[PDB]
């Protein structure tokens, strides 16, 4: 019954907001002006980025160990929403952590999304904003912006809210073609049930928007292939630079192959 889908529906944005203290309500409010929230200081060159300090080692280095830092964060964040998925934290131990190794980084890009325009991304919990053009002017790491704001253009365009994004960002998680996966049938049994909620909630939350499910489980290879570049990318920047540290659990989750 869709009635038992509406409740799963209303459990996972509940805990969603309770695990991401960073919305996407929060961060369109303050990307767009709104008096909800404050106004962002925004970091469009290096001057920019010095004063970002009295208000909120090399530049590059800098911002991607804050994009590890963040990410790191974000994985804590991840793992306590997913123990909310009803069954996830009754299967097999292994497969909870094969399904939050290959996951977390989907689930990133789509919360990046959240926090993009065309222009620019939030930053610090949305205190600063930095800009498209500046994060594309950094040699190795000139281009490791870019894929993920092309993505999150396109996304943006479903008018996803969070309440959507919460069950789409579980069914992310609970996949079942990961690698290495021990027992796959309970899983895929609990993402039939995730996919069937998220079908009624885009159907309900977004009646006007014909294939709108379709269109949203089409934006997976998309993030597929942001985490797919972005590993050969660190690959690069890695060897390059033999001083620039990863965090463990990062190096961890980018288990080769
Ligand atoms: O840019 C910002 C914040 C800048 C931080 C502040 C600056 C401190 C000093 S100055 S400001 N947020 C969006 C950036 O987009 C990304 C890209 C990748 C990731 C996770 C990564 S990166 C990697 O190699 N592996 C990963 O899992 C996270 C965010």
């Given at each position: 019954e869709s009635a038992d889908l509406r409740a799963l529906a209303k459990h996972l944005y509940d805990s969603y907001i309770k695990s991401f203290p960073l919305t996407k309500a929060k961060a369109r409010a303050i990307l767009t002006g709104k008096t909800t929230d404050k106004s962002p200081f925004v970091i469009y060159d290096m001057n920019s980025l010095m004063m970002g300090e009295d208000k909120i080692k090399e530049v590059a280095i800098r911002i991607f160990q804050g994009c590890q830092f963040r990410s790191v964060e974000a994985v804590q964040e991840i793992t306590e929403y997913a123990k909310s998925i009803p069954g996830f934290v009754n299967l097999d131990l292994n497969d909870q952590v094969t399904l939050l190794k290959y996951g977390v980084h989907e689930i990133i890009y789509t919360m990046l999304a959240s926090l993009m325009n065309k222009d620019g991304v939030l930053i610090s919990e949305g205190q600063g904003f930095m800009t498209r053009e500046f994060l594309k002017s950094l040699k190795p790491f000139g281009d490791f912006m870019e894929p993920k704001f092309e993505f999150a253009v396109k996304f943006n365009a479903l008018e996803l809210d969070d309440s959507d994004l919460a069950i789409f960002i579980a069914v992310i998680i609970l996949s079942?073609?990961?690698?290495?996966?021990?027992?796959?049938k309970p899983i895929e049994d609990i993402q039939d049930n995730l996919l069937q909620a998220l079908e009624l909630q885009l159907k309900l939350?977004?009646?006007?928007?014909?294939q709108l499910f379709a269109k949203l489980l089409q934006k997976m290879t998309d993030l597929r292939q942001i985490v797919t570049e972005h590993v050969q990318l660190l690959q690069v920047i890695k060897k390059t630079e033999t001083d620039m540290s990863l965090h463990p659990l990062l190096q961890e989750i980018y288990k080769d192959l």
């Open positions: 079942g073609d990961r690698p290495g996966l021990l027992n796959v939350n977004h009646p006007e928007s014909s």
